[PDB]
Amino acid sequence: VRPRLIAELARRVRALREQLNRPRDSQLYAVDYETLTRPFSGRRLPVRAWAD
Amino acid sequence: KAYRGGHLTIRLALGGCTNRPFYRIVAAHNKCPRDGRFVEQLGSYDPLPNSHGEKLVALNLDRIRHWIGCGAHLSKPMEKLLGLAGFFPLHPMMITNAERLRRKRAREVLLASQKT
Amino acid sequence: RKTRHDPLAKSKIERVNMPPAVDPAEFFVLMERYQHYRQTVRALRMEFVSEVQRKVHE
Amino acid sequence: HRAIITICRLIGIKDMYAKVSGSINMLSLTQGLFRGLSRQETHQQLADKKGLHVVEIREECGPLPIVVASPRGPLRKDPEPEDEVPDVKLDWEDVKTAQGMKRSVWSNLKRAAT
Amino acid sequence: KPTFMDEEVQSILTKMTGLNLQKTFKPAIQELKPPTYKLMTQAQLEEATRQAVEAAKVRLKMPPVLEERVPINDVLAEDKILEGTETTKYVFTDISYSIPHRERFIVVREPSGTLRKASWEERDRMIQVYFPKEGRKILTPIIFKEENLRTMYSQDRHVDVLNLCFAQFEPDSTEYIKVHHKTYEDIDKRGKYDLLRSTRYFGGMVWYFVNNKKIDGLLIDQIQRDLIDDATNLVQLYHVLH
Amino acid sequence: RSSVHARWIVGKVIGTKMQKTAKVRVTRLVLDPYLLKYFNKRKTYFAHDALQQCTVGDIVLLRALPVPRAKHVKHELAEIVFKVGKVIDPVTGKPCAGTTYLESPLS
Amino acid sequence: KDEPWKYLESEEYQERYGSRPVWADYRRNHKGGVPPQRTRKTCIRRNKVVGNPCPICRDHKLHVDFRNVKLLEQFVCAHTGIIFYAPYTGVCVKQHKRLTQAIQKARDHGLLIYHIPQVEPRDLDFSTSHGAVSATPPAPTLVSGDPWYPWYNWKQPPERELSRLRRLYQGHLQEESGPPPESMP
Amino acid sequence: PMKGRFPIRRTLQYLSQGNVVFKDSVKVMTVNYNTHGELGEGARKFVFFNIPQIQYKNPWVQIMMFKNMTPSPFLRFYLDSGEQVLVDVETKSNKEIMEHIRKILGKNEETLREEEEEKKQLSHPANFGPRKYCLRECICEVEGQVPCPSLVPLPKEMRGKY
RNA sequence: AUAGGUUUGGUCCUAGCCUUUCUAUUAGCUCUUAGUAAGAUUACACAUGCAAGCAUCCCCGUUCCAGUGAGUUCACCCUCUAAA
Ligand SMILES: [Mg+2]
Ligand SMILES: [Mg+2]
Ligand SMILES: [Zn+2]
Ligand SMILES: [Zn+2]
């Protein structure tokens, strides 16, 4: 039989990476006080979270 | 097809031609296509009226309630239809729409009085 | 409809998720209505679950 | 067959199915048809020979049985030997028509008028 | 006191309309098929005859005079926020294969602050739309017109008339009973009863005439027949009913 | 738990040169859609005759295990229902031969 | 003449046939074997009679209507309740559909003669014991007039919650009014 | 015609004409008899004529055919529990054993009627299924709305043209 | 398959090929109005336009929808067993 080993290897590698070298909140959950943006994505935030 | 937690969700499904809107409530998944695979079929929906109106709607509660208790969710139009039929309490969105219509009618009456 | 890895038509990135204004009395009335309606819906769901359990037992 | 159609129209038969099997020889086919028409067991003669009446349960009418022929004297009081699973050599076409298994590009298509 | 299911009354009614294995089991212009022949003895012939007699007996059975229905006047819920806003009246019902049509819940969300259970006509219409029963056309048939009704009466074939009247409307509808009484009155004009001998007649004609005391035609028919004991029994039944 | 499909099975024994096992097939009768006649159809199957009591060409029953403990095996020989040659008659418990009684009945 | 109901029993129609069928006199010319499954679409060609005239499209005094009982009964097997097929009829398909519709209308009117069987009642029982047909006691709110759950209607909440929401929705408010006016001409 | 002796033995209609329906218990059906021995006419006629019917009534149950295996033929069955149902037909008629099995192991009329009612319930005649499984796919083919915009154009209230 | 043409100076027997009917298209021409289904044929490469953000900052659609018929017994039935 020809099992799908490359797919399982890639899945395991990606899981191990995303679980071990996960980016800390300081990198992705950061907030820019000049435009209210979150690094690692480059998107804005709701309007009800401005003055906060 | 293995969906991302495709839980049962009673949703609507088209079934008419161009210039002929027709729908049909069906107990399908939350991610399956509109006219795709489904488990059980419920009473079809008749949107367009006819001679003295014939807005007919039916439901098979014996199995609908069973599938609901089996872990199935409901959509917004499903809740609207349930409220229009009387099974579930009147949807609050319908009451808000009725209040907005009453306010619009009051504004129209005010405008008509201002016409003079 | 967009499979993440796509040319993503850059036509929606120029908008602000602004929430329209709201009234006080109407908003509170609607909040109470939603709370009571959700309570009733949960009660009906619990009743249906109890009926299904009784049927399974029988 | 159209020749058989004309023969039936001349004889009097209105409509009757017939599978024209085998080769299509006009002379031999007509001779065989005449021989078959001349060799036929009627109802009255069969009843007089055997004795039993003609029992039937027509589907068009109701279950009320109507005798078609009766003997000319005696009457076999004993019933026929109702031996199930008899040895009636039926044709494969009969089974194909009963089970609807027959399929072709000219099975039972619409024919001309008249 | 009336006793519609009385043994003697039912026996006299069955006597009025003989079995008739030839008229009741009459062929109809429908699909044809090649009959089948067999050869049996006389005992099997007698068994077939008595089986056909039992089938003919099972044939007649209906119908009873269920009178006119009553319009259902029961409201489920109501609303004060609407009260005339969304007209057209939305109809809603419930499906239950294990429940007859006489125990449904066809709700109709009307614009006014109410929620009735629909009438009987709309109920039957919705039932036919959801559960198409044999016959019962959605729209009223044109045969029930005055001119068409007169033409049908002139055909001298009131059997098919009653058959269509029973297949179209329900046995409890008002128009159904009205058309049935009209047909019975038409049959009353110019005495004749040999036509309604292989169909429903004992429950719609004889019983109705006994209730209305219109036993003149029945008495004339009995006198034309031959029986006298049956006439005395009918007189006794009439005296008992009144 | 109970993953096997075919539970109770009674086939003919053929393969026996194996350890605590034996091959078995069932001479079933499948229907033909065109000929409408049944023919002698058979398919080989694996059994778990832990004792190898049965021989070649006999009739024995096999008990399907709840879960197949290997790749192809999924049954287990329970007992010899009918030993060919030394078969016992259902009625009149006595041996029998080719349409003859090895030991006379009445006992 | 003009909706033919007297000419059907005339002398010319009886001499032309009398007892023979009118659909059999028309023969179909075609290729070898059997003609196509479809006949001519229309009797005429939007003006005059083109091609082999139909069995009815040859005289102006041969109209069709619900009153044409004998005509419709003779042009179709009145003794067999089975409609033929287009090759058997061998007529302008337009007139074929017209005759089918006319026969249906005659059957729905009562002029045509044919066996009409009956059916069984809609329900084995003829009682009205269920609540859906016997009675339905109302609720206290139904008798009081106000619908169930009075909080559905207008209910001016206390000013404290309104001030709290205004604090939540500072520079984003609208003009609210009293209860919903129930006027609408 | 058919190239066999008794063509009526295999005609589908003759097979569907049966009646016996083994309950959900019997797992194997073994039969054996002596053909040369004319004493076993009942068993011979059975194995010859009724076996196709039994196999058509339920192909899941196992059926094994054997010949010379004992002086006195017999019909040995096997239940789902482990027991056996031994019914003899030697010197008897096939109809006798047929009625016996129908009354013992055959599915009573109650179970058949219940299964028929369940199947009818599954055959929902109200839903607008895709013909193959139900009837009337769309409301345009039945009374309730315009009878198909193709068969007749829609009224002036058609969407879009406004 | 209810049928026809066909080997010869002629007939009988066997049998080949084609015609007769319905579907998919367009080479040709020709097409009054209006209505309805569908408009890939290329698993070759694509200009571009557009198709999915609500939202007190978080889950969440992006892992669906919409297409392909290259490859292709991965679909139906039973048991086990987490996500709802
Ligand atoms: Mg030549
Ligand atoms: Mg491929
Ligand atoms: Zn014309
Ligand atoms: Zn349509």
Coordinates of C-alpha atoms in Angstrom, one line a residue, chain B residues 14-108:
Chain B
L14 CA -34.4 28.2 -3.3
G15 CA -36.5 26.3 -5.8
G16 CA -37.9 28.8 -8.3
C17 CA -37.2 30.3 -11.7
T18 CA -36.1 33.8 -12.7
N19 CA -38.8 36.3 -11.8
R20 CA -40.3 33.5 -9.7
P21 CA -39.0 33.5 -6.1
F22 CA -39.6 30.2 -4.4
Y23 CA -38.1 28.7 -1.3
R24 CA -38.3 25.5 0.8
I25 CA -37.2 25.1 4.4
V26 CA -34.8 22.1 4.7
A27 CA -33.0 20.5 7.6
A28 CA -29.4 20.8 6.2
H29 CA -26.0 21.4 7.7
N30 CA -24.6 24.8 8.6
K31 CA -22.0 24.7 5.8
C32 CA -23.6 22.5 3.1
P33 CA -24.9 24.2 -0.1
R34 CA -28.3 25.7 -0.3
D35 CA -29.7 23.1 -2.7
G36 CA -27.2 20.5 -1.6
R37 CA -27.3 17.4 0.5
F38 CA -29.8 17.3 3.3
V39 CA -31.3 14.9 5.9
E40 CA -35.0 15.5 6.0
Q41 CA -37.3 17.8 4.0
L42 CA -39.9 19.9 5.8
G43 CA -43.0 21.7 4.6
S44 CA -42.2 23.9 1.6
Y45 CA -42.6 27.7 1.7
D46 CA -45.0 29.6 -0.6
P47 CA -43.9 33.2 -0.8
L48 CA -45.8 34.5 -3.8
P49 CA -49.6 34.7 -3.3
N50 CA -52.4 33.9 -5.7
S51 CA -56.2 33.8 -5.8
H52 CA -57.3 35.3 -2.5
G53 CA -53.8 34.5 -1.3
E54 CA -52.4 31.0 -0.5
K55 CA -49.4 31.5 1.7
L56 CA -49.2 27.9 2.8
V57 CA -46.6 26.6 5.2
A58 CA -46.4 23.2 7.0
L59 CA -44.0 21.5 9.5
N60 CA -43.5 18.0 10.7
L61 CA -43.0 18.6 14.4
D62 CA -42.7 14.9 15.2
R63 CA -39.3 14.9 13.5
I64 CA -38.4 18.6 13.6
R65 CA -38.4 18.7 17.4
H66 CA -36.4 15.4 17.5
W67 CA -33.7 16.8 15.2
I68 CA -33.7 20.1 17.2
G69 CA -33.1 18.2 20.4
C70 CA -30.5 16.1 18.7
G71 CA -28.1 19.2 18.7
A72 CA -29.3 21.2 15.7
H73 CA -29.4 25.0 15.5
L74 CA -31.8 27.4 13.9
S75 CA -31.2 30.3 11.5
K76 CA -32.7 33.8 11.5
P77 CA -35.4 33.1 8.8
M78 CA -36.2 29.9 10.7
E79 CA -36.9 31.9 13.8
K80 CA -38.9 34.4 11.8
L81 CA -41.1 31.6 10.3
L82 CA -41.5 30.0 13.8
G83 CA -42.7 33.3 15.2
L84 CA -45.1 33.9 12.2
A85 CA -46.5 30.4 12.7
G86 CA -46.7 30.6 16.5
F87 CA -44.6 27.6 17.5
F88 CA -42.0 29.9 19.2
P89 CA -42.7 33.3 20.7
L90 CA -42.9 36.3 18.5
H91 CA -39.5 37.3 17.2
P92 CA -38.3 40.6 18.7
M93 CA -37.1 41.8 15.3
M94 CA -40.6 41.5 14.0
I95 CA -41.9 43.7 16.9
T96 CA -39.1 46.3 16.2
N97 CA -40.1 46.3 12.5
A98 CA -43.8 46.7 13.5
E99 CA -42.9 49.6 15.8
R100 CA -40.8 51.2 13.0
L101 CA -43.7 50.8 10.6
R102 CA -46.1 52.5 13.1
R103 CA -43.6 55.4 13.5
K104 CA -43.4 55.7 9.8
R105 CA -47.2 55.8 9.5
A106 CA -47.3 58.4 12.2
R107 CA -44.8 60.5 10.2
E108 CA -46.8 60.0 7.0

